[PDB]
Ligand binder design. Structure first.
Ligand SMILES: CC(C)CCC[C@@H](C)[C@H]1CC[C@H]2[C@@H]3CC=C4C[C@@H](OC(=O)CCC(=O)O)CC[C@]4(C)[C@H]3CC[C@]12C
Ligand SMILES: CC(C)CCC[C@@H](C)[C@H]1CC[C@H]2[C@@H]3CC=C4C[C@@H](OC(=O)CCC(=O)O)CC[C@]4(C)[C@H]3CC[C@]12C
Ligand SMILES: CC(C)CCC[C@@H](C)[C@H]1CC[C@H]2[C@@H]3CC=C4C[C@@H](OC(=O)CCC(=O)O)CC[C@]4(C)[C@H]3CC[C@]12C
Ligand SMILES: CC(C)CCC[C@@H](C)[C@H]1CC[C@H]2[C@@H]3CC=C4C[C@@H](OC(=O)CCC(=O)O)CC[C@]4(C)[C@H]3CC[C@]12C
Lengths: 600, 600
């Protein structure tokens, strides 16, 4: 009790509903889904405190609003609208339409019978079959990642400190300074993000696209964006993670991509545009996943090996028993909706999902970057190649959704579990909130999507309701119909080499003594700057430099003030994401565009 | 003794010589003469300390290098290169050439016999006749302005604190914090100015031309440039000065100029470009000088009235006796060089010079802005109208130089006297340094100018050595040949109205009780934003806002730390002016141009 409340369920439903509308409409118009996890924590506090104070004003007495209750409300609210974008409503499930089929055009794999129309009944059934699969895998993941590996989730840590500060009324020698120090940088970060908004009024202009080291380095993604989220995240991360991130940027963007791009006419065709698996993006996706798989497989096998040895020498199996039940339920249900999907396609997806989900959850616990979109695109490509021209596009799209959603749900909610750990929230109550929130998400989102779908015209390339990613994901399946031959030359060989390189580094860190194991780079921390630019790496290294400078200047103060200052920078930028979404919701666009030119 | 040293004279000659070359070449190529007063103080310290330490390394003993000696060296050095730009070598004396005469073209007033060629003999004689006139007027001005009126010269105050910090080795509870606090902001301001340099690579782009309130307000000069000099200057100025500066910007740029510009076809011709006395710049120059004259005349008359009453009831006259001697020497000498100039033209110039010099020196003591260039342009216009088409262009140019130089010398060296006051430097030793420095300036500058003039081609509009202001000043004289009829409609009436308005405000402040005299705006502080934009006013108000916020937060700390922090911001930007000049000297230009566009 005192954590699961009726008022909390009502507040979570309201927050989950309004956030679903914001996420859905933005996805159906621009496709740039914002991260609104931090804003939900603030809205949960304001809504419930206002309700309690309203009762106080009228004389009605209510139960005290504690920090554990606030975490549960955010947890239920987050899972409600997470399905809105993790379910592929604007990316993959929208790519099954006949409208998207016609936009793709006449091409191999795009057979006349590979289009599906949206509907409330099948979408709700599709989500319920697969949404409750990731939740069961989370229970074993919480122990190994949050409490055993002690991974720091910067978004989870920042939200936990924010939630604690709201409910911390104790007067201590440090508590007062923690809150006041948090407020000074929270307001500054929010105003800084608010100020930047007026000058990001075009393609690649603003403080985000600032060439701090010149235009030549900026085009190589080696600039410094003024993002306090990445600076704040890097402050609470260990230096080895921040250094490893810089190495990945230098190896990929400073060495590898310039060298590989020198063969734009020999290795891969030059007529095809970039950002496609046939041209220079095959290297981006496959090498990046190779590093994570090379490191993720070693860790996952080691955990199984340790567990196997412990049992041989002698609720963990309860979660997997329930996971198998939902896995079978999905296997018997999904091919009924889609004749294209075969029964064993779903079995393979569910078998490798805990492994893929573990890798992304582990990666999110180091660099605060959720790479579940990359896994869905890779899973879409391989599954599309597992079927011929017939029943291939739908097979890739549907199988991609299962992998994309389960992996995204895992990483997103692991940070939410990190918040519960720091706020002394009961894990069993957290499990109930996610199940209730996910169940409502599987009902609200299909209803919300159909309300937009029926009222407006979605998918028109020359209209307000344009979904660019619906066609992009459709083209990935069409290109994925053909096998691995479409990948550029030496793409598999280099990926296999980096798989070995990732494997060697993982082994090297656990075999060498602890003295020399503090300097081995992390293979999957280096993998993040392979898809995103090196600007993220520079920001993380700046955060470590600030902590390194602060620690030397004042060892005592930096011990307890760095988490508070780092959280304020993350929260302040995170809070502004809600007004920025509303401005984007109301078609209000930035007035000015701060462009940089080479003294033309 | 201990202030006038042989090593100081040698160092001042070297600093004065190198600064003359930098000022002369920049004036002959771009015309944007930098303010290098702060950089001279640092170079004086480094040069002499290195000389003393070199003697220490070799075992040679030397007299201790004190703060008074440092002030004298900067004083002699500043006066040496001040004549380089205050003498109109690149603006007015270059406008007398036959090359400039041909560029002006066929127009009334530009008679065939109104060109003069440069020469070492007459230029040296011309300067010696008029350069030592302003110095004598300074001696009475020091008492009334520096010590009696207690005007704060932000550049003089900042240099004095910088010079004191170099020679302050005492260990006190506050002295250590004063120096360390100065160093933190001095390095930050220097790096900030250094960082901005790479992005100001074009016409109106960079952090200086930042539309902090939108593009509409920026075109109205109501933006916030990131200039730490103006922010630092406003911190040590009283709030009434900073508020009055904002009022002048709102009245002129927010009300007057938009309304007057609405008559671009009726009041003044629209074909003629702006920034000319015939179109919208007559209002800028005449109204701005009207406010200063309205306030300056009241103060100057009051000082004479107080002095007259004191004598009636009963070295001041020594300075004026010497000033009259040089005034007569100029009168008998200048018309010999120029047949165009008549004897009584010089007499009128020297009679009104102490009045004009007092007004600019008083204005420089409030807003740290030297407006002697405006007086020279106004003096050029009226004196050109005092002669017909014959002997009119030369009469305006020559008479403009006397007014421009004497007024510029007064304001520039009054800040130097403010430095001596705070550094406990002997005023009589300061007088000797200025005379020696001015005498060398009248010799080095004509030699330096002729070295460039003989070696290269100066005045070519399509060459590296282009002097835009030489022709602009030439056109002012040609337009000034015709009388006050060329001024736009109602220009004199509005200027006369603001003359009364300035007079009323000056009287109102001294007649009302001290309780209500703290809120009367200063007429000549409002006059500064009439020529420059309102961005300067905003920066000054930001500095007052910082002090107002700092004082409320910590009354004790803001008492002694504000001058140190304000000086560091001014000095840091001032020091960078020297490397920026060297980069401009070596034809090195900024790489990037940070342009702002309306989301085109
Ligand atoms: C003490 C700390 C704060 C150091 C400050 C960081 C410097 C190492 C950075 C800041 C500005 C940077 C410069 C910003 C811009 C350029 C322009 C760039 O020239 C271009 O190529 C621009 C486009 C073009 O000219 O074609 C060359 C690198 C350079 C000098 C960068 C080099 C590295 C600099 C000096
Ligand atoms: C200390 C922390 C806070 C970050 C500071 C990093 C920068 C000072 C340095 C480190 C890595 C450097 C980069 C390392 C590698 C490259 C690759 C190089 O790319 C190419 O070789 C061009 C290839 C082509 O022509 O396409 C251009 C310089 C650049 C961007 C360097 C620019 C300056 C960077 C970003
Ligand atoms: C708490 C403190 C820090 C307040 C922050 C200052 C605000 C009062 C300033 C900062 C940004 C300013 C905005 C910056 C840019 C614009 C664009 C401007 O639109 C334009 O006209 C741009 C050119 C065009 O669109 O044609 C309208 C004013 C506005 C909203 C400005 C209004 C005033 C703002 C919000
Ligand atoms: C508080 C301190 C630190 C300075 C902050 C000042 C700004 C918040 C305000 C004060 C004065 C304002 C200005 C007052 C007057 C005008 C005149 C107005 O000009 C016109 O009427 C346009 C004329 C034309 O169309 O040519 C445009 C708005 C502007 C620039 C305002 C923009 C916003 C300003 C700069």
């Amino acid at each position: 009790q005192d954590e699961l409340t009726v008022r909390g369920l009502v507040a979570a439903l309201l927050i989950g509903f309004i956030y679903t509308v914001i996420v859905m409409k933005i996805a159906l118009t621009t496709g740039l889904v914002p991260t609104l996890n931090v804003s939900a924590a603030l809205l949960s506090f304001l809504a419930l405190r206002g309700w309690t104070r309203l009762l106080e004003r009228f004389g009605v007495v209510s139960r005290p609003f504690t920090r554990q209750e606030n975490t549960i409300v955010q947890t239920c609210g987050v899972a409600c609208y997470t399905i809105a974008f993790a379910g592929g409503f604007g990316s993959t499930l929208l790519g099954l339409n006949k409208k998207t089929y016609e936009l793709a055009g006449d091409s191999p794999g795009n057979v006349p019978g590979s289009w599906k129309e949206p509907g409330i009944g099948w979408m709700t059934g599709f989500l319920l079959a697969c949404s409750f699969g990731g939740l069961l895998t989370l229970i074993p993941l919480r122990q190994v990642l949050v409490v055993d590996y002690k991974l720091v989730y910067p978004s989870g840590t920042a939200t936990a400190i924010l939630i604690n500060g709201f409910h911390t009324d104790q007067g201590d020698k440090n508590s007062r300074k923690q809150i006041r120090g948090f407020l000074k940088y929270f307001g500054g970060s929010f105003l800084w993000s608010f100020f930047q908004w007026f000058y990001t009024g075009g393609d690649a202009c603003g403080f985000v696209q600032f060439p701090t080291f010149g235009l030549k380095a900026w085009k190589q993604t080696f600039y410094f964006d003024f993002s306090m989220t990445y600076v704040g995240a890097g402050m609470i991360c260990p230096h080895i993670v921040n250094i490893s991130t810089l190495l990945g940027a230098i190896i990929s963007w400073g060495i590898m991509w310039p060298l590989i791009s020198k063969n734009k006419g020999d290795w891969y065709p030059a007529k095809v545009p970039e950002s496609s698996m046939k041209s220079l993006y095959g290297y981006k996706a496959f090498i990046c996943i190779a590093l994570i798989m090379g490191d993720g497989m070693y860790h996952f096998i080691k955990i199984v090996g340790i567990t196997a040895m412990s049992m041989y020498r002698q609720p963990s199996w309860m979660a997997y028993a329930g996971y198998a039940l939902f896995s079978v339920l999905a296997v018997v249900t999904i091919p009924v909706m889609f004749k294209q999907v075969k029964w064993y396609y779903v079995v393979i997806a569910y078998v490798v999902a805990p492994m893929l989900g573990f890798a992304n959850s582990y990666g999110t616990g180091l660099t605060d970057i959720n790479m579940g979109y990359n896994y869905g695109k890779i899973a879409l490509f391989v599954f599309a190649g597992w079927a011929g021209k017939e029943n291939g596009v739908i097979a890739g799209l549907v199988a991609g959704t299962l992998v994309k959603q389960l992996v995204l749900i895992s990483a997103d909610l692991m940070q939410d579990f990190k918040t519960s750990y720091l706020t002394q929230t009961s894990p069993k109550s957290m499990m109930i909130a996610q199940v209730v929130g996910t169940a409502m998400g599987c009902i609200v989102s299909p209803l919300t999507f159909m309300l937009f779908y029926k009222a407006f015209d979605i998918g028109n390339p020359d209209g307000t309701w344009k979904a660019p990613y619906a066609l992009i994901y459709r083209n990935m399946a069409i290109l994925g119909v053909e096998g691995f031959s479409v990948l550029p030359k030496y793409c598999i060989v280099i990926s296999g080499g980096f798989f070995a390189f990732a494997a060697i580094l993982s082994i090297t860190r656990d075999v060498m003594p602890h003295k020399y194991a503090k300097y081995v780079p992390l293979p999957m921390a280096m993998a993040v700057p392979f898809l995103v630019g090196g600007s993220f790496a520079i920001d993380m290294c700046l955060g470590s430099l600030i902590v390194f400078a602060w620690t030397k200047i004042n060892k005592k103060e930096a011990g307890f003030m760095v988490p508070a200052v780092a959280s304020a920078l993350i929260c302040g930028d995170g809070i502004w994401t809600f007004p920025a979404s509303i401005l984007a919701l109301a078609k209000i666009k930035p007035p000015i565009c701060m462009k940089f030119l080479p003294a033309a």
